């Protein structure tokens, strides 16, 4: 009736009978044949979609814990109670294909995976419906995060423009630098780039532990209001470091371009879509206007700042100032602790 199956690496029937093979001799009465106990051996050992798309659809429908009929009503009604930003992206990829619609149209007996597609097909302009709330919810999470970045960079530029210690500090090093480099190619220069302050610690003294920044801080320690109120004014530019304005500007424009493109598609739809989603799209359109308007103010503010430092345009690309200034402030704090430690010990 049934025997336990032992697995062996079967050799081909044309190779195992070759002369070099040892099995050739066994196939002929050339060896002492032995017969096992045959009496005891028997009594002792006795859908239309592809798998890629169909399975991925069921997995997508198994995070809701509802029937396929119920989930179709939510898409038709545009409800977003259980639909999030990431969930919509997976649904956008999982859409009927050219061959899938033809097979369904040519057609319970069909599996539950295609059952949702049939219900989804009955929904008018299902492609447009998913894109409508994807942009609105995404735009809500974009404006509230770009805006603090826009205010932070604008505030940093104004504080940097209105700073009092930098004109005092940049003059002291310039006066000192002329003395240090007298009689050479360097020195006697009217000014220098903002990157100069980042190399102040490279000038070591005889002790090899006190740098040029340490020495100018030692004489600045006598006058606490002078050269020591600077880090208080550098807090805002320091936080602005690492936040480039090119990505945030492109993101606002890219979302607006997609939102404007879908606005025409929504307007071409039935009046039911207009009365409860059209006003949502235009609300986000008007909200972004204040966001890009503030960007022009930042561009105007940084244009003065670009000419404030007397540096060539396209070279002072905003983020360069933020990174250099934060590092300069970071080095300033470290020198203060060392100077204080030197005074006490």
């Amino acid at each position: 009736l049934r025997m336990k199956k032992l697995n062996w690496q079967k050799l081909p029937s044309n190779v195992a009978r070759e002369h070099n093979s040892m099995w050739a001799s066994l196939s002929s009465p050339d060896a002492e044949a032995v017969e096992p106990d045959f009496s005891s051996i028997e009594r002792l050992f006795s859908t239309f979609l592809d798998a890629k798309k169909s399975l991925n659809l069921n997995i997508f429908l198994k995070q809701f814990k509802c029937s396929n009929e119920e989930v179709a009503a939510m898409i038709r009604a545009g409800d977003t109670t259980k639909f999030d930003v990431e969930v919509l992206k997976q649904l956008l990829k999982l859409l009927p294909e050219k061959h899938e619609i033809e097979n369904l149209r040519a057609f319970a007996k069909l599996a539950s995976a295609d059952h949702f597609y049939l219900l989804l097909l009955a929904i008018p302009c299902y492609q447009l419906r998913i894109e409508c709330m994807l942009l609105c919810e995404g735009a809500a999470a974009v404006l509230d995060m770009v805006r603090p970045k826009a205010q932070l960079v604008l505030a940093a530029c104004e504080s940097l423009l209105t700073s009092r210690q930098l004109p005092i500090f940049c003059q002291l090093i310039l006066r000192i630098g002329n003395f240090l480099n007298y009689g050479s190619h360097t020195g006697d220069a009217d000014g220098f780039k903002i990157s100069t302050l980042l190399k102040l610690t490279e000038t070591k003294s005889q002790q090899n532990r006190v740098t040029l920044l340490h020495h100018v801080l030692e004489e600045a320690e006598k006058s606490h209001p002078d050269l020591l109120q600077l880090p208080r004014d550098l807090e805002q530019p320091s936080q602005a470091a690492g936040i480039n304005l090119e990505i945030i500007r492109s993101e606002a424009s890219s979302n607006l371009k997609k939102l404007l493109e879908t606005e025409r598609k929504v307007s071409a739809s039935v009046a039911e879509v207009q009365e409860q989603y059209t006003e949502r799209l235009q609300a986000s359109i008007s909200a972004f206007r204040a966001l890009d308007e503030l960007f022009e103010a930042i561009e105007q503010k940084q244009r003065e700042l670009a000419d404030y430092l007397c540096e060539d345009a396209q070279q002072l690309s905003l983020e360069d100032t933020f990174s250099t200034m934060k590092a300069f402030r970071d080095l300033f704090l470290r020198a203060l602790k060392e100077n204080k430690d030197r005074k006490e010990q």
Binding site: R2, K5, L6, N7, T47, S54, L55, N58, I59, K62, A111, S112, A113
Partner: peptide, 25 residues
């Protein structure tokens, strides 16, 4: 648990009669 409960997943199961033709391979 999710994968085993799918209605369409029953086609990817090695039946006992299927094993009687090909072994553990």
């Amino acid at each position: 648990s999710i994968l085993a409960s799918l209605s369409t997943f029953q086609q990817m199961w090695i039946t006992k009669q299927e094993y009687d033709e090909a072994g553990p391979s």
